[PDB]
Amino acid sequence: MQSIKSNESFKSVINSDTPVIVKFEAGWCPDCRAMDLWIDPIVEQYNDYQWYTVNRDELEDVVVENEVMGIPSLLVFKNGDKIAHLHSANAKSPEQVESFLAETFK
């Protein structure tokens, strides 16, 4: 998962013809840390898609405008449009993330 470090970079990768998956997170967060222990196989299954991270405190403008309400959240984009949003309250286990991505990519 490559880190996005600016608003322009964010705009740029979300205007992809092929879908893009972005994890919003922060370094202090033990739920964000948890997710990293189990997310790598899901990333591999979903290899065909680009995965990125956004630090929630670093790009607030992005966070607020994409209606990111807690962390970790997983949002999916295609041609600039937000196509799915996994809110952090439901992002607690690999089962939950897998199910969200299956529902979004079906």
Side-chain angles (χ1 to χ4, degrees), residues 62-94 96-102 104-106:
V62 173
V63 164
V64 317
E65 201 60 30
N66 288 279
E67 301 176 353
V68 170
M69 307 301 194
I71 55 182
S73 297
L74 213 53
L75 318 199
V76 181
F77 296 85
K78 189 190 176 70
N79 301 299
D81 301 318
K82 196 174 51 185
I83 64 166
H85 186 128
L86 183 56
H87 177 47
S88 53
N90 305 328
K92 289 297 214 298
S93 66
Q96 276 171 312
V97 174
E98 281 180 356
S99 166
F100 166 73
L101 295 180
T104 125
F105 284 106
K106 268 168 34 170

Side-chain angles (χ1 to χ4, degrees), residues 5-7 9-32 34-49 51-94 96-102 104-106:
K5 70 169 183 65
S6 77
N7 293 345
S9 188
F10 180 79
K11 307 201 317 202
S12 170
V13 302
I14 72 158
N15 194 215
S16 159
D17 222 42
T18 283
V20 163
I21 300 158
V22 188
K23 183 190 171 199
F24 288 74
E25 68 175 350
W28 64 271
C29 183
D31 299 326
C32 294
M35 173 168 294
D36 286 336
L37 292 170
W38 41 257
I39 201 81
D40 290 4
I42 297 172
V43 170
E44 180 183 320
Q45 165 172 199
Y46 287 89
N47 260 359
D48 288 341
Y49 310 112
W51 291 67
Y52 298 96
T53 54
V54 163
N55 188 103
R56 193 268 331 273
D57 297 314
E58 191 161 294
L59 301 172
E60 178 173 57
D61 286 0
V62 173
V63 164
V64 317
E65 201 60 30
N66 288 279
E67 301 176 353
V68 170
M69 307 301 194
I71 55 182
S73 297
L74 213 53
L75 318 199
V76 181
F77 296 85
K78 189 190 176 70
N79 301 299
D81 301 318
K82 196 174 51 185
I83 64 166
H85 186 128
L86 183 56
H87 177 47
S88 53
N90 305 328
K92 289 297 214 298
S93 66
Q96 276 171 312
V97 174
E98 281 180 356
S99 166
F100 166 73
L101 295 180
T104 125
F105 284 106
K106 268 168 34 170

